[PDB]
Design a protein around this ligand. Structure first.
Ligand SMILES: [Zn+2]
Lengths: 304, 42, 34, 353
């Protein structure tokens, strides 16, 4: 349909295979395939349990991936239940992915920044960290070792700083795995994103099964403060009919706009007011043929 | 949206909803009532 | 060919045929679809 | 008109009426008001008192006295003296009065500036081509027999209700309704318009009709093509908003009041079918023969023939002999109408009472 819809679907698929497990992949693929889904339809499609979808729905709600709709409809048996509907907001989802990847790369860049700091010291008895600044004030009279304040034991060197190359390798090994996401967000920013909702995502629905208990028709509430082309073809034989119609309409409007008889005429002298060639052409055709031979549920309805 | 703009990354979303957003009277022609059709517009 | 107005919450489409006409019901989900 | 045709802001325009008294705060602006805003000597509101003090205390450079023929009235003469304005323009369409005070408007306003040629504007498609007519209704024998011994107000009450004018008006409505002509029928007497409207089943608008009815029936006459005939009172003679009509019928009249006829004719003169070629608007003055109608109507048409319009006299209608519906054809119905016109003329003890 929309190529931008395909781009955001591919982006959501890539991030759910990347930073999520298989069941999250199944849930997001069900949402991107069937655009509007409910809880019972998801249970029918995925054979998932409530205690199993609980972590799934909680995680995709915490990660801001699936928009949930709180709508209760009235079934004909009057057993109305609060059914939940799962759809996706594309601009909110791409902004969430943008913010998450930006904070990921910011956190890992800060890790690479802080791992350039020297090793520091650490007391194995008290298991308390020490930076480079306070190691000097723990120096003994022998001017060699750094004695702990509480344990009175020489400090050992923490293994931080030699992993700076490991953090750089982690940073590069993260970033070569995120470049398709970078390209997808570049293509999104080069285009326009239409902000949808439940009423708009219902336009591209795919039915999960034949019989779904949750209806897909929105019920409005009052007081909540949260054309045709028709042609006419003439065979060059009926034009006289509508030209006769035109001239009779012209004389009709002339008569309707005509001066009345008592205006144009004097009413004084009149009384006071009070209370066969078929055989010929057949023989002609016979003669010409001989000459050629010689020569050779009820509700309101409107019509449309 | 606005802290994306503050961070220099242009947003692809419209600002959300949390952002500040918006007699009868008598008749005298009773002899032919039900014929006069209501004209609330031209 | 019969349609429901957009103001009506009941959403129905009906088709009238020609020769006992055959009448078929078409309930939809989205209004732009109709 | 100021808000539409000229570049005047609504903050520069103001209204002095009963409901509206707020004015422009700018140093110079504009206000539109009624004549009896200024010239009323009655005990008024403090707001209107302050307003007229402001109007007196403001020096005006121009006043537009619309419908200037009522200015020579006793209160309305004083508005050019109370309101000190440099230039006074008297705009009207009917510069005629029954009394001689219409000549005093030279002292009130000034010399007569421009006279518009009615026939010149009619021929070039600016005002409508009206066909002024005078329908002669012969007075019936019983009605005239009772008419010759009656007092004057009852004389009008008798000759307005002859059946020949009933038949003539019925036929004119029937014929011009078939022509697609909007018709406004003027009759000043309330009893006359009510009797005709109940006879023919037509809408009627007299003085004490509710205003919302005078709007609903107005829009039905304007737009609903089923209704093409409205019977209208002296209220329609003055400035009230009415739809466009091409035929007018005058049943009764307020004496020979030479202002009223041109006020009535100006309603038909605004006809929208003017630009169509062959269009002819119609005017009818239905008069009762051998009664005071010709005296009054000759006074009425003296002004119009001074302007140049020609009232073609009509003494016979082609269609009486073959009319489908007949009003007062029988002598018994006419006699019944005759006798109908003859018979026409302490906090606890408060709950105690
Ligand atoms: Zn220690």
């Amino acid at each position: 349909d929309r190529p931008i819809d395909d781009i955001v679907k591919n982006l959501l698929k890539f991030v759910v295979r990347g930073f999520y497990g298989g069941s999250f992949v199944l849930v997001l693929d069900a949402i991107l395939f069937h655009s509007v889904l409910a809880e019972d339809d998801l249970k029918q499609l995925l054979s998932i349990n409530k205690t199993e979808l609980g972590p799934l729905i909680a995680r995709l709600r915490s990660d801001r991936l699936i928009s949930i709709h709180k709508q209760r409809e009235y079934p004909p048996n009057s057993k109305s239940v609060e059914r939940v509907y799962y759809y996706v907001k594309y601009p909110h989802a791409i902004d969430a992915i943008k913010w998450k990847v930006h904070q990921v790369v910011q956190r890992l860049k800060d890790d690479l920044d802080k791992n350039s700091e020297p090793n520091g010291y650490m007391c194995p008895i008290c298991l308390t960290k020490y930076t480079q600044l306070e190691a000097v004030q723990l120096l003994n009279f022998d001017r060699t070792e750094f004695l702990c304040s509480l344990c009175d034991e020489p400090l050992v060197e923490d293994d931080s700083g030699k992993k700076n190359k490991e953090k750089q390798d982690k940073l590069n090994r993260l970033m070569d795995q995120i470049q398709p996401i970078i390209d997808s967000l570049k293509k999104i920013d080069d285009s326009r994103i239409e902000e949808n909702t439940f009423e708009i995502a219902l336009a591209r629905l795919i039915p999960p099964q034949n019989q779904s208990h949750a209806a897909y028709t929105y019920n409005p509430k009052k007081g909540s403060t949260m054309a045709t082309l028709h042609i006419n073809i003439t065979t060059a034989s009926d034009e006289v009919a509508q030209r006769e119609l035109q001239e009779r309409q012209a004389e009709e409007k002339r008569k309707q706009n005509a001066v009345p008889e008592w205006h144009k005429q004097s009413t004084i002298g009149k009384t006071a007011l009070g209370r066969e060639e078929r055989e010929n052409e057949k023989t002609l055709n016979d003669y010409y043929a001989a000459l050629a031979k010689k020569q050779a549920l009820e509700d309101e309805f409107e019509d449309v | 949206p606005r802290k994306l703009q503050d961070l220099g990354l242009k947003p692809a979303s419209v600002d959300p909803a949390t952002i500040k957003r918006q007699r009868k009277g008598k008749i005298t022609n009773t002899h032919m009532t039900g014929i006069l059709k209501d004209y609330s517009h031209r | 060919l019969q349609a429901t107005p957009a103001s009506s919450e009941k959403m129905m489409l009906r088709l009238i045929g020609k020769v006992k006409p055959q009448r078929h019901m078409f309930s939809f989900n989205n209004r732009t679809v109709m | 008109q100021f808000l539409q045709w000229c570049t005047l802001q609504p903050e520069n325009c103001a209204v002095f009426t009963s409901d509206n008294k707020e004015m422009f705060q700018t140093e110079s602006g504009l206000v539109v008001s009624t004549y009896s805003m200024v010239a009323n000597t009655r005990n008024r509101s403090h707001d209107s008192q302050k307003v007229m003090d402001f109007l007196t205390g403001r020096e005006w450079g121009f006043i537009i006295l619309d419908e200037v023929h009522v200015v020579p009235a006793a209160m309305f003469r004083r508005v050019v003296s109370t309101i000190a304005a440099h230039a006074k323009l008297g705009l009207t369409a009917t510069l005629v009065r029954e009394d001689d005070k219409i000549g005093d408007l030279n002292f009130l306003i000034g010399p007569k500036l421009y006279e518009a040629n009615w026939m010149e504007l009619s021929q070039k498609g600016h005002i409508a081509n009206v066909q002024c007519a005078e329908v002669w209704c012969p007075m019936t024998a019983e009605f005239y027999q009772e008419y010759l011994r009656e007092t004057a107000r009852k004389r009008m009450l008798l000759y307005i209700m002859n059946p020949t004018k009933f038949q003539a008006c019925q036929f004119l409505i029937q014929y011009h309704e078939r022509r697609g002509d909007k018709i406004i029928v003027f009759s000043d007497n309330v009893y006359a318009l009510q009797e005709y409207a109940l006879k023919m089943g037509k809408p009627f608008i007299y003085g004490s009709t509710p205003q919302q009815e005078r709007m609903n029936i107005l829009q039905n006459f304007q737009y609903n093509d089923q209704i093409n005939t409205i019977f209208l009172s002296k209220v329609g003679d003055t400035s009230i908003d009415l739809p466009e009509a091409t035929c007018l019928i005058q049943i009764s009249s307020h004496y020979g009041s030479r202002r009223q006829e041109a006020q009535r004719l100006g309603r038909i003169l605004r006809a929208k079918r003017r630009n169509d070629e062959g269009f002819n608007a119609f005017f009818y003055s239905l008069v009762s023969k051998d009664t005071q109608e010709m005296y009054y109507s000759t006074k009425r048409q003296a002004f119009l023939v001074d302007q140049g319009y020609a009232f073609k006299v009509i003494t016979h209608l082609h269609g009486m002999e073959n009319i489908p519906n007949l009003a007062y054809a029988s002598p018994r119905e006419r006699r019944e109408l005759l006798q109908e016109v003859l018979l026409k003329n302490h906090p606890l003890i408060r709950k105690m009472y």
